[PDB]
Design a protein around this nucleic acid. Sequence first.
DNA 1: AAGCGACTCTGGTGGGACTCGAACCCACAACCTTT
Lengths: 579, 689, 240
Amino acid sequence: HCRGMAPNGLPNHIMAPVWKCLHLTKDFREQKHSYWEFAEWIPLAWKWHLLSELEAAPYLPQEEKSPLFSVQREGLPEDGTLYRINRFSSITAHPERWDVSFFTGGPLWALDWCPVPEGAGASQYVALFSSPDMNETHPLSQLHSGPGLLQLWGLGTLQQESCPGNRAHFVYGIACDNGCIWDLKFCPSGAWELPGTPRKAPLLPRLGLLALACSDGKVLLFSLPHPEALLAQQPPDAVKPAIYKVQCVATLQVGSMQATDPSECGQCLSLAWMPTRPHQHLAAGYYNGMVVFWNLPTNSPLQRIRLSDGSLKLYPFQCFLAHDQAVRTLQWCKANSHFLVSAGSDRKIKFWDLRRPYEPINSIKRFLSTELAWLLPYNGVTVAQDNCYASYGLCGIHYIDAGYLGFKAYFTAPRKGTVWSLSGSDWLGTIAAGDISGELIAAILPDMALNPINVKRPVERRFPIYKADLIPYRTYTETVNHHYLLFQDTDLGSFHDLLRREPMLRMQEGEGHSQLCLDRLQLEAIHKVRFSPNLDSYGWLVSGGQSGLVRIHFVRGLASPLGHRMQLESRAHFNAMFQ
Amino acid sequence: MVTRREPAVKLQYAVSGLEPLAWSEDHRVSVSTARSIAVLELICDVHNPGQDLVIHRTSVPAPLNSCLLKVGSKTEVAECKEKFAASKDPTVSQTFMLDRVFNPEGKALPPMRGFKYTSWSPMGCDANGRCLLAALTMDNRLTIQANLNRLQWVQLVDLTEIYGERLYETSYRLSKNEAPEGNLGDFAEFQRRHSMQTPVRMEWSGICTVGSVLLAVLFENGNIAVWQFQLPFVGKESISSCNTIESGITSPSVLFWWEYEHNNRKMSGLIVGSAFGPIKILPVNLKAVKGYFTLRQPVILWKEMDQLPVHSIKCVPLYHPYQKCSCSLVVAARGSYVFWCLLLISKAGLNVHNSHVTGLHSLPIVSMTADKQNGTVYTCSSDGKVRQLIPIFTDVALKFEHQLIKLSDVFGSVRTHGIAVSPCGAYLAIITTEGMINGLHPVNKNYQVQFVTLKTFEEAAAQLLESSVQNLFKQVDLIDLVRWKILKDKHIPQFLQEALEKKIESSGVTYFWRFKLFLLRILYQSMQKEPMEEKLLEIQGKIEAVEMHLTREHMKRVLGEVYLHTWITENTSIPTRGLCNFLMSDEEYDDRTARVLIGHISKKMNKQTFPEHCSLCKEILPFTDRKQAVCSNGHIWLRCFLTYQSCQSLIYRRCLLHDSIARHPAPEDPDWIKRLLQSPCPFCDSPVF
Amino acid sequence: MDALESLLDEVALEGLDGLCLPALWSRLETRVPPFPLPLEPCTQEFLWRALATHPGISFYEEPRERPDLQLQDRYEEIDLETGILESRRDPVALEDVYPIHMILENKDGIQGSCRYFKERKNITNDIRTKSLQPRCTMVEAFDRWGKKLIIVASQAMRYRALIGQEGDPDLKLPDFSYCILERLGRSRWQGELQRDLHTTAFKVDAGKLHYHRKILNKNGLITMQSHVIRLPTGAQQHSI
DNA sequence: AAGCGACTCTGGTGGGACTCGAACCCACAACCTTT
Ligand SMILES: [Zn+2]
Ligand SMILES: [Zn+2]
């Protein structure tokens, strides 16, 4: 127990786990990531066909302009103007606080950061999916199979000198004919190489490997080129939204050779890559409750077939009936990849040992849950709830030990609404969560090797990032015509006097007492939240929601000298290894 | 052909573990479940008219105490467990805290005391003529169970307890020169001492010739412990050896025994399949029995390491029509496929052929069963598909042809968690669960066991007439199909009667008289148990006549052995003169062989009476009648149906069908009647217990 | 069913309250199907040895002597008009031999009614050695303890006697629902009327008896009929 | 003093079991009800 106050204004015993998590995450990645994997799966220019304007029109999300919004920033003078931005466009970063907002044309339902090796200093990208229509909503029990666009957004390099005046750039998108995308996961490491890598004209330097959980019941795997390598091949006069039709590296689907009998598994709902080198397994969760594993390198004629176009179709090597109801979320253990956790709409969290799938390590029945996060250093998992079964005033976010330490669930944050999405920063040891209330909070977990019951006042460990309010001005147009989004942003520069600052009072008056609104579209609701996995930009967060606006925030108060210390030493090591 | 049989069997607890349904040679069906093993005992009930399957239900309780694998001193292990859990390395600490092998119980961990796997021994392994049950919990307690009385299973031995001590006494070294006494405080050696004794799966050998049976236990590290049990198995006393062979197979998933005969030369091995895909037969290089011998060198059946886990193995003896020799067919479930391999000894040695029969299922195969008499395979997946898969001989090796059986048509939309097949292929038993209802999930889950007829009555009747095994108890599942028909139609189908009379005329061995007695007793039950009264009296007269015939044949055989061994002048345990009088009592049967045998005996018999006495009186019992003896005071003593001695003891043995009674053997009995008292019941071939 | 098993079955068809020796002979004499032996005094010693030598049977001394059984026969089974009437013809409702006192929440899981369950003492090791050899004759046992000698079958035997061979031993029942089933069991061929169970056996709301009876119907351990009680009023009452 | 980690002390809700209130049903006597 370390006394005194950090310069960011949190007590040192509250910040001390955050500082420890930097070393533990670095030591893990040195041992269990790798610099290059899947050396065959590299992008080819002839596999990327640019759509004309007439061909792209079915795929673009249908709203051409955002809702009107204004952003108020704690302690600054009031803006008072209303912004509105075109689809595939961004406002400029605020000069002091570097928050960026951009619009994707539809409600955001998948989002991931492109992972980049430590010290690389690369350009940072997010891949996301926003549904074609703001008001259409899809059943779980049915395969959708419609069109959709996978969007790749560059955020800049997010260096301090780069952030003032930064803007998000829509670098390209892939027109998919595979329905909506319910999850996105990049290969955790070894997928990225320098954009300057000399490669022969058919080949392109590789930006990442991206797996898509499609609403038509299959997983699609893409290898992504760096944008400049495409634009060098692209005609110079081409249409400025670069929409491509792209061949998969592989399509991953449940079945067997010559087994014409279509699988009952239904829609693919969630993904997890194998966290550890060589990342050779990918898992998915299905609507029927099965968890399904594909052995990505597999040569075996019983699992791999090559289609006439040259793409692979991969059948799984292992499947088991994890849940008695739709398995909504997976997390695969980083510290030892024999273990995986899943949660399903039977409202059980089940821990698995993949060597022994016949019985879970531990089943805990809980409230219905939307997403899980497994922070590397902690044996348990933090859970986001759908509120529909929680006791009023006890709904929120819980950390749950996997069971050996035997602690009770730790109530990290009360929330009134359903938390739609959750993301744990391994580098920060903090967690961020988005609510149908339209509020984004962050919370610092205690060191969960130690019994949480001593955490006598958890509210000192959480803070809001922003809240979206509808201000008057059941369907999108009737809502947009009569409301605008007031985004209220916290001063994340420091947490001094936190519990007396108005954003905390506003949040604390939200918790427990505020009543959910059901006579509207929920236009303020936040659907995905993602901390950066990269050591560069480790303190950055991205979020998006029903508005189809996507917002980026730097949590300046949790960035720290050890992160700078580690970024520079990693820069030196990287610059020595690659030149 | 496939239709449901009427009783669904409700299960109180969740079905649990690997490949959870099995059907023993003893017609007891076990389902391994989270709180017990439920055992369903199929009785061809001759005392009731109900057309259902008469399923007697028993269970093995789950253990009350969690099992800790011994890896060191009680204090030495405790300081090590503290060291690992407190470790600041995420990998070491979380590897310890997540793996349930190191943590069989905890403060907030559910106890893993339900059953992982179960295997049925061959018949004749129990202290009675019955089979033993090997049962494995998920906390790695391996136990052998028997049902000595009918009501309650008792644990005969815990094999994990013994093996843990025998490893500890050798410091966890198999060869004492080969390794150091590595420090338990090293996580690799700590994990090893757990891994080297965590049982995956186990299987019984056939009966080795005094009888013996092996049990091979597969461990996570690829060791196999081959236990040898002396028979009848009564506990730790009967464990003749334990020997560990190092398979070296990484992550071994499944085990089965290979036993085979060519030119009357016996051979055997263990076939072992990895979770990572390959399949290999080990030569069992170590054994003590002299009559068997073992394969000379390992053969690789599948080498690919494709990581399709070998979930199940079965094999069946066959005779190949074109190679004109006996061969062994191996079938193994590998993901959603069935691997098959045919093993054929010839002048070239082993000739081997293999393939994957493909397109069976769109999900992994959750269970597999082999029809031992035909090699018909059944395979199943949790989408509720079951596929019948028929081996068809090819000029060399085989082809497999297969067809779905529509469980949808008999049970509706259903999930299937396991299948089993009756020893003659008469029934398929299925663990059904509520299926997806038009794409919706079922709200509530309730496991059941359900049965479907695999064979028509006409095929069951024909196969019983042409039965090579000629014991009814080996065929309870076929005579149950015959029973169902007779109870349904209240008459014996004429072609079966005519064919049976032809067999009794042309062969007349007591098997056919036993088969006649079964049909007539089920007929009597069918007709509501005064033309009906006249018909009841007529057929009851026929039952009594054939029941009397079977009695004379047994009495003749008993006296036809009293004559062969040394004459028991003290008349010690057989009412010899009473039986002679009973056989001579009528001239109605002309069999001179009996009439001269009782002549030779009565010439040799003592003039001293040596009568049987009623223990409540010390007064004679006259031997008036087959079933029971009486005295002037009016006491009634049943007679042992194997030896006709009166069952005056406070405990005696009763047939599975209660149709017949037998005495317990005593130390005063000579060996030859101690062997005679092990005969099955003369009327129904069921165990007399 | 075998004679030796029919003895142990009858001992197990009384509940946890068990039998006195004179009650046991009365139960065997009234058995259907008939008991095979003549039940002579020498036979009673033989059957007594069959109890003492059986490890599941157990013996207790209760604080007070139990009443002897009535003639249980419930039904008239005659008429003067055409046919016969098998309506209930009421015996005198004398003091019940087996008043309901449910053994709730037992840590060993044994269940049933017994008014003295906490008060009676085991005398198994007085009646037999731990090697199951009988230490007393029947006449010595009845001389020493009289009606205070109580014979009880093990829970496994008692529950088996309620469910038969086709029944599933894994099924736990609530204590009140088990005590309904046990109250049926000791009635043998002439089951209790549901009217009488709630009115005078359990002394509860008819809603309570129905509710606790539900599980026995759901698992199918009991069979339901409408039946007729001929009152001294001459009118006759419907009951289950 | 100011601070910490067990150890309590205090209002609030759900899980399964169970009280609750209702209509429904027997079989009889009353007789209204009919040629
Ligand atoms: Zn006598
Ligand atoms: Zn018999």
